[PDB]
Short mmCIF file of C-alpha atoms and ligand atoms in Angstrom, two decimals:
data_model
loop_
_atom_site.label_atom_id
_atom_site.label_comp_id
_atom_site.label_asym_id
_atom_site.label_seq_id
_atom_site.Cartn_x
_atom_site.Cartn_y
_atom_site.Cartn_z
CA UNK A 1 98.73 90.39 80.95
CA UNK A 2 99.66 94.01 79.73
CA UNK A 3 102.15 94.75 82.24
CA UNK A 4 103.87 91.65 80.70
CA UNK A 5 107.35 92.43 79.03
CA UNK A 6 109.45 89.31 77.29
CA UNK A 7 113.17 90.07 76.04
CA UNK A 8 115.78 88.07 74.64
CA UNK A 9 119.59 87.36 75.48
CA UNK A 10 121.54 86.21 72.97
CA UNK A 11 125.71 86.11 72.17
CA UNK A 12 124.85 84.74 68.91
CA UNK A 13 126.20 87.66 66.83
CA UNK A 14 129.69 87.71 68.87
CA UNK A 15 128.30 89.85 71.39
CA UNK A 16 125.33 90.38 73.96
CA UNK A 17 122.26 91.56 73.04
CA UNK A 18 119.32 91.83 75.55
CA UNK A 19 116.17 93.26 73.16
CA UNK A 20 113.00 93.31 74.05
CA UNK A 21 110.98 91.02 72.03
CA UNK A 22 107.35 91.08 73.20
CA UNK A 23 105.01 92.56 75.91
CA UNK A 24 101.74 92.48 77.13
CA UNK A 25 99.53 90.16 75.40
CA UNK A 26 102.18 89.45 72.48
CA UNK A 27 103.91 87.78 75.48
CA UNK A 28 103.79 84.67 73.94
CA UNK A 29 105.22 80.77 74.86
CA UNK A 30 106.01 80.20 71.13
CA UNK A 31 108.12 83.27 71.44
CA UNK A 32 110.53 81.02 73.58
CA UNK A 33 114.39 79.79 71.94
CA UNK A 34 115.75 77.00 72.93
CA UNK A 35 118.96 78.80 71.58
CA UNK A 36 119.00 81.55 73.86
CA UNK A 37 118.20 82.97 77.74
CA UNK A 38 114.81 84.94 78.13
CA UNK A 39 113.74 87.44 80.71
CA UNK A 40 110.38 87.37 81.78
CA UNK A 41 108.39 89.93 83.66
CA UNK A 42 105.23 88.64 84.34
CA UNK A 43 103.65 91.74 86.38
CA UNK A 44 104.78 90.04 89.52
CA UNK A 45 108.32 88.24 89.08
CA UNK A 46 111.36 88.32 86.81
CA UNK A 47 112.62 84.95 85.44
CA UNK A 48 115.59 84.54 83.86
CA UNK A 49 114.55 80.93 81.03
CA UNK A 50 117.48 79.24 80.55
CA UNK A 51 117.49 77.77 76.95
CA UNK A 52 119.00 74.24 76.73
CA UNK A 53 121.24 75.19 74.16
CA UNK A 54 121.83 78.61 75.37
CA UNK A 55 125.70 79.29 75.38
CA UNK A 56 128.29 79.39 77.99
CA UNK A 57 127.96 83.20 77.97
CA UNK A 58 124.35 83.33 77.91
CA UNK A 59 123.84 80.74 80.76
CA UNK A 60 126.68 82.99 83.15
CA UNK A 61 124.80 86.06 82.67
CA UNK A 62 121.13 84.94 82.40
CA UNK A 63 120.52 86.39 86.19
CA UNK A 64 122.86 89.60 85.76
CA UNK A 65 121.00 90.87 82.48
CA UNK A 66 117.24 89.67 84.49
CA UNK A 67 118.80 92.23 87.45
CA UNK A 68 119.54 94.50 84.46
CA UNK A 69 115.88 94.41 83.57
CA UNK A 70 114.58 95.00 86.71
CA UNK A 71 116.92 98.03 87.18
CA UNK A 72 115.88 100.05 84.45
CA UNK A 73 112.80 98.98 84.48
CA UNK A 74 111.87 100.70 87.80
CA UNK A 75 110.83 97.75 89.49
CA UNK A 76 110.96 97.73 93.36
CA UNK A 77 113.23 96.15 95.24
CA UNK A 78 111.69 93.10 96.55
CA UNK A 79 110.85 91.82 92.81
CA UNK A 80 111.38 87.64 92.80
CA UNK A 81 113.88 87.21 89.95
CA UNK A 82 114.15 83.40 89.66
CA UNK A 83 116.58 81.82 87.43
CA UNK A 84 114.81 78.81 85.56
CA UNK A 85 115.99 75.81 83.37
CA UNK A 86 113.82 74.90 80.21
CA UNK A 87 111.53 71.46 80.33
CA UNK A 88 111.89 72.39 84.26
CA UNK A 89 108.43 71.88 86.23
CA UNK A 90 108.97 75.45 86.49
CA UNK A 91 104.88 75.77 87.83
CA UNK A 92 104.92 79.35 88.90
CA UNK A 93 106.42 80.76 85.49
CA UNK A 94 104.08 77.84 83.44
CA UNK A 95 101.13 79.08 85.24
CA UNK A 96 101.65 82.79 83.16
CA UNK A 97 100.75 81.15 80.07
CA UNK A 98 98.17 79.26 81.53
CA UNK B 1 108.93 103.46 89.70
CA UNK B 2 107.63 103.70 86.60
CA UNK B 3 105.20 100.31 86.58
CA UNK B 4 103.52 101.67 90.32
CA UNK B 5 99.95 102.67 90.06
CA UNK B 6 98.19 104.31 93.16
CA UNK B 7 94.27 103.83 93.11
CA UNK B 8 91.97 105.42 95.96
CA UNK B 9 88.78 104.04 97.37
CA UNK B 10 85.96 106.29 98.72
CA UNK B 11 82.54 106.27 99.27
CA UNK B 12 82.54 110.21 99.91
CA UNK B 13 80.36 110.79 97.34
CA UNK B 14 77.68 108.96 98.34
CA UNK B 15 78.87 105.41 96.96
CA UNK B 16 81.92 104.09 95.85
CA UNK B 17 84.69 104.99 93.65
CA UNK B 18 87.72 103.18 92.49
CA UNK B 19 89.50 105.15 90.42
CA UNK B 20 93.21 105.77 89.33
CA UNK B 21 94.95 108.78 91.21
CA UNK B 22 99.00 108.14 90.78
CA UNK B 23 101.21 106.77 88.38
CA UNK B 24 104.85 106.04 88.16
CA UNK B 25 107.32 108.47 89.91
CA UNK B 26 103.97 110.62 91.03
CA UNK B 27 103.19 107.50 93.64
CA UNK B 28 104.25 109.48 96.57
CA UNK B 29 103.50 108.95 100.19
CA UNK B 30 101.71 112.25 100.76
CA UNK B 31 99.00 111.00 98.67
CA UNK B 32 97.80 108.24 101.21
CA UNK B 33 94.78 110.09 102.97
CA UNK B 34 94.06 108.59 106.03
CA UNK B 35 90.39 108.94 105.31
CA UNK B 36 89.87 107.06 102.18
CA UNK B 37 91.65 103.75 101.58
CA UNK B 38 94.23 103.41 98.59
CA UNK B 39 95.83 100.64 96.60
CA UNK B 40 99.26 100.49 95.59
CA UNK B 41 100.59 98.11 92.97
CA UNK B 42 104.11 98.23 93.33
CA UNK B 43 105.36 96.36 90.04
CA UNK B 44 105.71 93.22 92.12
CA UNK B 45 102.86 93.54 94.66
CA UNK B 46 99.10 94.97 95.80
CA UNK B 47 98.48 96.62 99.11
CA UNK B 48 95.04 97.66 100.35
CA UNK B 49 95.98 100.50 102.47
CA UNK B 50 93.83 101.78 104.98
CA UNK B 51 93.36 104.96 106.15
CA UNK B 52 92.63 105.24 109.99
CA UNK B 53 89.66 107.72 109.17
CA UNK B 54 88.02 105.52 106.46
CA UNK B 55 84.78 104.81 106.92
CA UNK B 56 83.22 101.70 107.87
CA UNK B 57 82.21 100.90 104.26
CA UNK B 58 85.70 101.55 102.89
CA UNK B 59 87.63 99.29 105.49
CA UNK B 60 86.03 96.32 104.84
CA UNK B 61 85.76 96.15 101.27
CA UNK B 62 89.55 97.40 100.57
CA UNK B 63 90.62 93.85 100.69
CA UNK B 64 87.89 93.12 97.82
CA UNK B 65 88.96 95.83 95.92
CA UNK B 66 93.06 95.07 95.76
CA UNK B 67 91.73 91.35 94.94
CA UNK B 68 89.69 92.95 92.22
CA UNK B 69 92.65 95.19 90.57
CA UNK B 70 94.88 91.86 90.25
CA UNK B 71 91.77 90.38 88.09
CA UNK B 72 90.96 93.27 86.21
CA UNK B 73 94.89 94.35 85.36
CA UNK B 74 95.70 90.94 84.10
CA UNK B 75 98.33 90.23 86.69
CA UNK B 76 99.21 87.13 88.05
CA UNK B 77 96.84 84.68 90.01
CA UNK B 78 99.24 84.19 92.75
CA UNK B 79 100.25 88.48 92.98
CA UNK B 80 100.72 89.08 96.78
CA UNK B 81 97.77 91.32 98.06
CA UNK B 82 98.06 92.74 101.73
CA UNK B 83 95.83 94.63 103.79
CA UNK B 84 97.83 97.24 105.64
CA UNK B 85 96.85 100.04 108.02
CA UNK B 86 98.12 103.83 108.23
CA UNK B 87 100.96 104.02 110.80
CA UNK B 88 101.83 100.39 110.67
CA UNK B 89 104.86 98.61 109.87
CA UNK B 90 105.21 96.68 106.70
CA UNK B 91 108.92 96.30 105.19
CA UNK B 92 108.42 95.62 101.63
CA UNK B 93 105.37 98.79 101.78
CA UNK B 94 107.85 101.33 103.68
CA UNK B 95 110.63 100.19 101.18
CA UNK B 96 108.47 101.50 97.77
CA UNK B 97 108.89 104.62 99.22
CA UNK B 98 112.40 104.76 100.13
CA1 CA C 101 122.43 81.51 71.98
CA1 CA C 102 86.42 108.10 103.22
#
Protein backbone atom coordinates (compact mmCIF):
# COMPACT_ATOMS: atom_id res chain seq x y z
CA UNK A 1 0.00 0.00 0.00
CA UNK A 2 1.29 3.71 -0.01
CA UNK A 3 2.64 3.77 3.34
CA UNK A 4 4.85 0.92 1.94
CA UNK A 5 8.69 1.76 1.88
CA UNK A 6 11.32 -1.09 0.44
CA UNK A 7 15.23 -0.37 0.85
CA UNK A 8 18.19 -2.23 0.13
CA UNK A 9 21.41 -3.36 2.16
CA UNK A 10 24.18 -4.13 0.37
CA UNK A 11 28.34 -4.36 1.17
CA UNK A 12 28.78 -5.01 -2.39
CA UNK A 13 30.79 -1.83 -3.17
CA UNK A 14 33.26 -2.43 -0.01
CA UNK A 15 31.00 -0.73 2.19
CA UNK A 16 27.27 -0.50 3.53
CA UNK A 17 24.76 1.05 1.80
CA UNK A 18 21.10 1.02 3.04
CA UNK A 19 19.06 3.11 0.01
CA UNK A 20 15.80 3.20 -0.35
CA UNK A 21 14.71 1.50 -3.40
CA UNK A 22 10.90 1.58 -3.68
CA UNK A 23 7.70 2.67 -1.79
CA UNK A 24 4.21 2.57 -1.90
CA UNK A 25 2.84 0.80 -4.77
CA UNK A 26 6.40 0.49 -6.58
CA UNK A 27 6.89 -1.85 -3.57
CA UNK A 28 7.38 -4.58 -5.65
CA UNK A 29 8.40 -8.68 -5.09
CA UNK A 30 10.54 -8.57 -8.30
CA UNK A 31 12.35 -5.77 -6.60
CA UNK A 32 13.80 -8.56 -4.24
CA UNK A 33 18.00 -9.70 -4.55
CA UNK A 34 18.92 -12.73 -3.72
CA UNK A 35 22.38 -10.92 -3.38
CA UNK A 36 21.53 -8.68 -0.74
CA UNK A 37 19.32 -8.00 2.77
CA UNK A 38 16.01 -5.90 2.28
CA UNK A 39 14.02 -3.89 4.74
CA UNK A 40 10.51 -3.93 4.44
CA UNK A 41 7.93 -1.66 5.94
CA UNK A 42 4.76 -2.83 5.12
CA UNK A 43 2.50 -0.09 7.02
CA UNK A 44 2.38 -2.44 9.94
CA UNK A 45 5.84 -4.36 10.47
CA UNK A 46 9.51 -4.06 9.56
CA UNK A 47 11.22 -7.18 8.09
CA UNK A 48 14.57 -7.47 7.67
CA UNK A 49 14.70 -10.37 3.98
CA UNK A 50 17.62 -12.14 4.28
CA UNK A 51 19.00 -12.88 0.72
CA UNK A 52 20.51 -16.40 0.35
CA UNK A 53 23.55 -15.12 -0.95
CA UNK A 54 23.61 -12.05 1.07
CA UNK A 55 27.18 -11.66 2.65
CA UNK A 56 28.59 -12.25 6.00
CA UNK A 57 28.26 -8.50 6.65
CA UNK A 58 24.94 -8.10 5.29
CA UNK A 59 23.42 -11.16 7.14
CA UNK A 60 25.12 -9.63 10.82
CA UNK A 61 23.54 -6.40 10.33
CA UNK A 62 20.25 -7.18 8.49
CA UNK A 63 18.24 -6.46 12.00
CA UNK A 64 20.54 -3.40 13.14
CA UNK A 65 20.05 -1.39 9.74
CA UNK A 66 15.82 -2.69 9.92
CA UNK A 67 16.12 -0.87 13.71
CA UNK A 68 17.91 1.88 11.74
CA UNK A 69 14.86 2.22 9.56
CA UNK A 70 12.47 2.27 12.05
CA UNK A 71 14.43 4.98 13.97
CA UNK A 72 14.48 7.56 11.53
CA UNK A 73 11.62 6.73 10.19
CA UNK A 74 9.49 7.83 13.21
CA UNK A 75 7.92 4.68 13.74
CA UNK A 76 6.59 3.90 17.29
CA UNK A 77 7.99 1.83 19.51
CA UNK A 78 6.10 -1.30 19.49
CA UNK A 79 6.74 -1.77 15.54
CA UNK A 80 7.28 -5.89 14.85
CA UNK A 81 10.67 -5.93 13.11
CA UNK A 82 11.06 -9.62 12.16
CA UNK A 83 14.17 -10.90 10.71
CA UNK A 84 13.26 -13.36 7.74
CA UNK A 85 15.21 -15.95 5.57
CA UNK A 86 14.40 -16.07 1.71
CA UNK A 87 12.27 -19.29 0.27
CA UNK A 88 11.11 -19.18 4.15
CA UNK A 89 7.17 -19.82 4.55
CA UNK A 90 7.53 -16.42 5.72
CA UNK A 91 3.24 -16.08 5.48
CA UNK A 92 2.83 -12.78 7.21
CA UNK A 93 5.50 -10.84 4.97
CA UNK A 94 4.13 -13.14 1.64
CA UNK A 95 0.71 -12.07 2.43
CA UNK A 96 1.94 -8.08 1.51
CA UNK A 97 2.29 -9.01 -1.96
CA UNK A 98 -0.63 -10.96 -1.99
CA UNK B 1 6.02 10.36 14.42
CA UNK B 2 5.99 11.29 11.18
CA UNK B 3 3.78 8.15 9.56
CA UNK B 4 0.80 8.87 12.60
CA UNK B 5 -2.42 10.14 11.25
CA UNK B 6 -5.23 11.26 13.74
CA UNK B 7 -8.84 11.08 12.14
CA UNK B 8 -12.06 12.24 14.20
CA UNK B 9 -15.53 10.83 14.01
CA UNK B 10 -18.67 12.97 14.66
CA UNK B 11 -22.05 13.08 13.88
CA UNK B 12 -22.32 16.81 15.28
CA UNK B 13 -23.37 18.04 12.26
CA UNK B 14 -26.22 16.23 11.80
CA UNK B 15 -24.56 12.95 10.25
CA UNK B 16 -21.31 11.66 10.10
CA UNK B 17 -17.93 12.79 9.32
CA UNK B 18 -14.67 11.02 9.02
CA UNK B 19 -12.25 13.24 8.21
CA UNK B 20 -8.41 13.80 8.73
CA UNK B 21 -7.54 16.25 11.70
CA UNK B 22 -3.62 15.42 12.68
CA UNK B 23 -0.65 14.40 11.04
CA UNK B 24 2.81 13.47 12.04
CA UNK B 25 4.42 15.34 15.05
CA UNK B 26 0.86 17.45 15.27
CA UNK B 27 -0.81 13.95 16.69
CA UNK B 28 -0.95 15.24 20.15
CA UNK B 29 -3.00 14.06 23.04
CA UNK B 30 -4.91 17.31 23.57
CA UNK B 31 -6.62 16.68 20.42
CA UNK B 32 -8.66 13.57 21.70
CA UNK B 33 -12.14 15.25 22.56
CA UNK B 34 -13.95 13.23 24.75
CA UNK B 35 -17.08 13.97 22.81
CA UNK B 36 -16.36 12.78 19.39
CA UNK B 37 -14.45 9.53 18.82
CA UNK B 38 -10.94 9.60 17.01
CA UNK B 39 -8.68 7.17 15.23
CA UNK B 40 -5.11 6.98 15.54
CA UNK B 41 -2.87 5.07 13.18
CA UNK B 42 0.25 4.88 14.83
CA UNK B 43 2.66 3.60 11.92
CA UNK B 44 2.22 0.10 13.29
CA UNK B 45 -1.37 0.12 14.60
CA UNK B 46 -5.30 1.55 14.53
CA UNK B 47 -7.13 2.56 17.65
CA UNK B 48 -10.79 3.58 17.70
CA UNK B 49 -10.75 5.88 20.57
CA UNK B 50 -13.71 6.78 22.30
CA UNK B 51 -14.61 9.71 23.85
CA UNK B 52 -16.74 9.28 27.11
CA UNK B 53 -19.20 12.07 25.78
CA UNK B 54 -19.68 10.56 22.27
CA UNK B 55 -22.84 10.00 21.33
CA UNK B 56 -24.62 6.89 20.97
CA UNK B 57 -24.19 6.88 17.16
CA UNK B 58 -20.44 7.54 17.35
CA UNK B 59 -19.61 4.68 19.94
CA UNK B 60 -20.83 2.02 18.15
CA UNK B 61 -19.72 2.57 14.79
CA UNK B 62 -15.97 3.67 15.82
CA UNK B 63 -14.99 0.09 15.58
CA UNK B 64 -16.42 0.13 11.83
CA UNK B 65 -14.74 3.08 11.06
CA UNK B 66 -10.88 2.08 12.28
CA UNK B 67 -11.77 -1.31 10.28
CA UNK B 68 -12.64 0.93 7.38
CA UNK B 69 -9.30 3.24 7.45
CA UNK B 70 -7.08 -0.12 7.30
CA UNK B 71 -9.14 -0.92 3.88
CA UNK B 72 -9.21 2.33 2.48
CA UNK B 73 -5.25 3.28 3.40
CA UNK B 74 -4.00 0.13 1.85
CA UNK B 75 -2.53 -1.25 5.02
CA UNK B 76 -2.20 -4.61 5.94
CA UNK B 77 -5.11 -7.23 6.33
CA UNK B 78 -3.92 -8.41 9.59
CA UNK B 79 -3.11 -4.33 11.07
CA UNK B 80 -4.11 -4.51 14.80
CA UNK B 81 -7.35 -2.37 15.33
CA UNK B 82 -8.47 -1.72 19.05
CA UNK B 83 -11.33 -0.11 20.49
CA UNK B 84 -10.20 1.94 23.44
CA UNK B 85 -12.03 4.28 25.82
CA UNK B 86 -10.97 7.86 27.26
CA UNK B 87 -9.31 7.34 30.68
CA UNK B 88 -8.43 3.75 30.13
CA UNK B 89 -5.30 1.96 30.16
CA UNK B 90 -3.77 0.67 27.02
CA UNK B 91 0.24 0.34 26.96
CA UNK B 92 1.13 0.40 23.41
CA UNK B 93 -1.77 3.68 23.06
CA UNK B 94 -0.22 5.63 26.23
CA UNK B 95 3.30 4.80 24.76
CA UNK B 96 2.58 6.90 21.15
CA UNK B 97 2.39 9.64 23.26
CA UNK B 98 5.30 9.36 25.41
CA1 LIG C 1 25.41 -8.60 -1.17
CA1 LIG D 1 -19.96 13.84 19.27
Amino acid sequence: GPPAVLLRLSDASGKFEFTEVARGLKVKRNLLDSNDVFVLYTGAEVFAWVGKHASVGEKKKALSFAQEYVQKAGLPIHTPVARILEGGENEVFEDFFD
